[PDB]
Design a protein around this ligand. Sequence first.
Ligand SMILES: [Ca+2]
Ligand SMILES: [Ca+2]
Ligand SMILES: [Ca+2]
Ligand SMILES: [Ca+2]
Ligand SMILES: [Ca+2]
Ligand SMILES: [Ca+2]
Length: 579
Amino acid sequence: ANTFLEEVRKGNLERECVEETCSYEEAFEALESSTATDVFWAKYTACETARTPRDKLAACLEGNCAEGLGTNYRGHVNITRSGIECQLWRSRYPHKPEINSTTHPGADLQENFCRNPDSSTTGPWCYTTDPTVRRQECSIPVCGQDQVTVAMTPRSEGSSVNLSPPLEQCVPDRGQQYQGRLAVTTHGLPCLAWASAQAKALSKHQDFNSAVQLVENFCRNPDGDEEGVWCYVAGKPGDFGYCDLNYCEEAVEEETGDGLDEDSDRAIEGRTATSEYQTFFNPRTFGSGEADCGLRPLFEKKSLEDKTERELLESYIDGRIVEGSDAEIGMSPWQVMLFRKSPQELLCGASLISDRWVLTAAHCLLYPPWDKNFTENDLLVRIGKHSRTRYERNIEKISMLEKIYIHPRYNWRENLDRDIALMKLKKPVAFSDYIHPVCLPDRETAASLLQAGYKGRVTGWGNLKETWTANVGKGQPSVLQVVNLPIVERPVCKDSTRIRITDNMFCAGYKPDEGKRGDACEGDSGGPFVMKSPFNNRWYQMGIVSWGEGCDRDGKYGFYTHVFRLKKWIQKVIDQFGE
Ligand SMILES: [Ca+2]
Ligand SMILES: [Ca+2]
Ligand SMILES: [Ca+2]
Ligand SMILES: [Ca+2]
Ligand SMILES: [Ca+2]
Ligand SMILES: [Ca+2]
């Protein structure tokens, strides 16, 4: 600024806007690169306390130290003060940040690098990937001293020395041989005495195993329910609650068939060997037409094959990843679109299991950290939709939710285990070409289909990508979209994530090679993952399209929540409504 005849000499960004109080004009004049201009401005601003001396401003230009509350820090530290992983600022997992990339673009928000966007009192902080705590301060160095902004005490997990190691063996056979005296539930609801009047009244119609004795008030699983030990709890009639037992990891794919000869070449299609559908659920409360699951009148009733079926066999051409393809008309009858009642907003996807029950992701209904706590009267569903933004009155239908059941084993605190939610419609919707329930595979059926090497199908409109990712550049498809994804190895699935994965969740999809990210984040969250069974010409839905690392992290596949074992559990719901 001073030395007036400076404006005729050539200049030095450091001999004008560093060793001297300068105009942003001379700054603008000397910079022009308006992105770095904003950067230098941000510098100046943050360096408002680093104006003097000169080397202090040089260090503030280096940016490795956070100035004051941490507005200027531009390093590479992306870890909380206690070692918790920093959540992506732009992404909504696991919390939707009111203060994020859109609100603070000038801070150079990196992948997860610790920042102080709002100049928070905790200094440079970061949102945490752990759903339990939304935010945590980062231990970022402050300028002027070799001092960090907050105490760095990394989280050491439970040790193998200071606690007592349980010698209790893992429970096999899903608890068909366990009779322990554990008497505490996961959610704390007390177990009603099995010999009491209410339990006897509720179980008189239930054929509990005679070998597994029914003790007074402990957790018992004699009904052959694969989920685990459950007990009746106080409250409304028929209330049930499941207890936590550390079952041995009983992968469905590892069931060895005792009738499969080792001649595995040229897989034989079903000819004169028709596998009939076995009704595991009573039509009275599970709904009529159960025998007609997944049978489209346009395709199944006339033996018309879709143009996308020729890719079912995993022996296809060198397993190259196939891009997204638009689905046909009427080929997605079991898809449901979970919509916000008020105001207008698309929420999630869901699977149609019966004409009067619907299956949807639990996180779409309940997520207190997400400011999301929906009652039965605040969301609706739409079945048989072709285009999201349009309304085709005749062929599509809408429904309003009445009753919601949440499985007590749904664990959103560690890994979103068992993302299960059940819904009931007050006004039933009859059968149609574009609306038809999908079949429910059992344990043996799932094992047979998975060991047959058939690809899975995921249908949706891209709402999963909108909800769990901030990737702008591929607009949300308003057209029905379908993606084919095969299965991968389970131990590799464990090695593909830094977070623990339960047996109820499995990997599916091609391996995204370096240089591109896979399409595992296509479709809608909570939607179906279906495979056309070659043994009965039917479509079996392996589970729910739940949140996976395929959205938030590149190089990952789709993680899906298994619901095939829940057959015994399913009736346990409608046994409450048998009146
Ligand atoms: Ca000057
Ligand atoms: Ca000047
Ligand atoms: Ca001078
Ligand atoms: Ca000038
Ligand atoms: Ca100048
Ligand atoms: Ca100089």
